[PDB]
Write a protein that binds this ligand. Structure first.
Ligand code: CA
Ligand code: CA
Length: 279
């Protein structure tokens, strides 16, 4: 399948080179997989989700995304026009308030919730969790991310936007999950992207068009935007049977575009998420 005039980030993950505008992907498109978006919520009624999104848990007064961030990330995972895995099932868990903030205890509870809730869902091709959030180092937050991964969920987390070593941020610094940095459309490390030895992979993160609340769209930037590209790619690859939740991060790194990025500090991987599609 081919989506013409795609957002640059989708085109980038299906090409060996920057500057293309078509997103090439297998028609299966993540069908049968499930992705939990752990964030500010998801505007499930947005036409772009085609009935494939639902809120399953909130830690606040409402399950509504009053911010937009969660809806944007969910759109990059699996919206029709802006998504990597266009037929996946999306589950929203609202651990962040409408200002985009949340206590660590709530974020931990949300991770533990997904590890249990997945046992009540029909996700034959597997389960992914996308965490476009983080803050200062916390061994408890790292431990929760490790538990979620251990339970059989592919966990993708944002490296953070401090232009610093991700070792000082959580859950970015948990080795066992998939920690995602951001790049721009000219294959440069995004100027804000964290780096360091704990990064596993880069994905498109600067000027990313996706869904927004009020049935709208907008373009924003961050490692928050790169993370759902990798989460969606994992769901896509698991549906194709190429990898499993336990090994998806490794498989993505193994099959990545290597050495394409500039402004990568020594000691940080030079690997860019790639779907290796061939018609
Ligand atoms: Ca290349
Ligand atoms: Ca890792």
């Amino acid at each position: 399948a081919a989506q013409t005039n795609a957002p640059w980030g989708l085109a980038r993950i299906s090409s060996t080179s920057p500057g293309t505008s078509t997103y090439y992907y297998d028609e299966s498109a993540g069908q049968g997989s499930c992705v939990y978006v752990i964030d500010t919520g998801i505007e499930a009624s947005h036409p772009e989700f085609e009935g494939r999104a639902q809120m399953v848990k909130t830690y606040y007064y409402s399950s509504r995304d009053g911010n937009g961030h969660g809806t944007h990330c969910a759109g990059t995972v699996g919206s029709r026009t802006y998504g990597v895995a266009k037929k996946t099932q999306l589950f929203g868990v609202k651990v962040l308030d409408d200002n985009g903030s949340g206590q660590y205890s709530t974020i931990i509870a949300g991770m533990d919730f997904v590890a249990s809730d997945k046992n009540n869902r029909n996700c034959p091709k597997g389960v992914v969790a996308s965490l476009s959030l983080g803050g200062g180092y916390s061994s408890s937050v790292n431990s929760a991310a490790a538990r979620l991964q251990s339970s059989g969920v592919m966990v993708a987390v944002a490296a953070g936007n401090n232009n610093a070593d991700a070792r000082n941020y959580s859950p970015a610094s948990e080795p066992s999950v998939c920690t995602v940095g951001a790049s721009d459309r000219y294959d440069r490390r995004s100027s804000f992207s964290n780096y360091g030895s704990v990064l596993d992979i880069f994905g498109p993160g600067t000027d990313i068009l996706s869904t927004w609340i009020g049935g709208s769209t907008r373009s924003i930037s961050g490692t928050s935007m790169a993370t759902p590209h990798v989460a969606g790619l994992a769901a896509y690859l698991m549906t194709l049977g190429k990898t499993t939740a336990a090994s998806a991060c490794r498989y993505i790194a193994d099959t990545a575009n290597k050495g394409d990025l500039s402004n990568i500090p020594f000691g940080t991987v030079n690997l860019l998420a790639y779907n290796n599609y061939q018609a």
